[PDB]
Amino acid sequence: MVQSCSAYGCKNRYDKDKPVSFHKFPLTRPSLCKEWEAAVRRKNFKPTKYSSICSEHFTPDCFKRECNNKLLKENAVPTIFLELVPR
Ligand SMILES: [Zn+2]
């Protein structure tokens, strides 16, 4: 537990061992960004400290980029909270 994320009551942990990464709510990805909202599903993901997501929810394939701490290409999505379902 060396870093928080948006995911309500998440079990993330920025440890030297745990290869978990963290990202901040992006602006380059807007429409798709709506998807990120699902990543939260909370009252209203306030960009104050919640404007960020952890890898634990993202798909391994979404980490194709070997950047410093910015891995969430157009593909990026918090699948784990994929609300998109047969309404
Ligand atoms: Zn998380």
From Swiss-Prot:
Outcome (variant: residue 46 to A): Does not affect DNA-binding
Effect caused by changing residue 50 to A: Partially affects DNA-binding
One function term, GO molecular function aspect: protein homodimerization activity
Is Transcription regulation among this UniProt entry's keywords? yes
Q: What is the effect of changing residue 55 to A?
A: Does not affect DNA-binding
Q: What is the effect of changing residue 37 to A?
A: Partially affects DNA-binding
Output the Gene Ontology cellular-component terms. Answer: chromatin; fibrillar center; intracellular membrane-bounded organelle; nucleoplasm; nucleus; PML body
Q: What is the effect of changing residue 8 to A?
A: Does not affect DNA-binding
Places the protein is found: Nucleus, Nucleoplasm; Nucleus, PML body
Q: What is the effect of changing residue 52 to A?
A: Does not affect DNA-binding
- Zn finger regions (THAP-type) covering which residues? 1-81
Result for mutant: residue 27 to A: Partially affects DNA-binding
Q: What's the reported outcome of changing residue 41 to A?
A: Does not affect DNA-binding
User: What does the UniProt entry list as the effect of changing residue 36 to A?
Assistant: Abolishes DNA- and zinc-binding
Q: For this entry, list what GO says about its biological process.
A: DNA-templated transcription; endothelial cell proliferation; negative regulation of transcription by RNA polymerase II; regulation of DNA-templated transcription; regulation of mitotic cell cycle; regulation of transcription by RNA polymerase II
Q: Tell me what effect the entry lists for residue 48 to A.
A: Strongly affects DNA-binding
Q: Which keywords accompany this UniProt record?
A: Cell cycle, Coiled coil, Disease variant, DNA-binding, Dystonia, Metal-binding, Nucleus, Transcription, Transcription regulation, Zinc, Zinc-finger
Effect of mutating residue 32 to A: Does not affect DNA-binding
Question: What is known to happen upon mutating residue 29 to A?
Answer: Strongly affects DNA-binding
Q: Note the effect listed for residue 24 to E.
A: In DYT6; lower activity than wild-type
Similarity comment: Belongs to the THAP1 family.
Q: What does this protein do?
A: DNA-binding transcription regulator that regulates endothelial cell proliferation and G1/S cell-cycle progression. Specifically binds the 5'-[AT]NTNN[GT]GGCA[AGT]-3' core DNA sequence and acts by modulating expression of pRB-E2F cell-cycle target genes, including RRM1. Component of a THAP1/THAP3-HCFC1-OGT complex that is required for the regulation of the transcriptional activity of RRM1. May also have pro-apoptotic activity by potentiating both serum-withdrawal and TNF-induced apoptosis.
Quaternary arrangement and interactors, per the entry? Homodimer. Interacts with PAWR. Component of a THAP1/THAP3-HCFC1-OGT complex that contains, either THAP1 or THAP3, HCFC1 and OGT. Interacts with OGT. Interacts (via the HBM) with HCFC1 (via the Kelch-repeat domain); the interaction recruits HCFC1 to the RRM1 promoter.
Q: What is this protein called?
A: THAP domain-containing protein 1
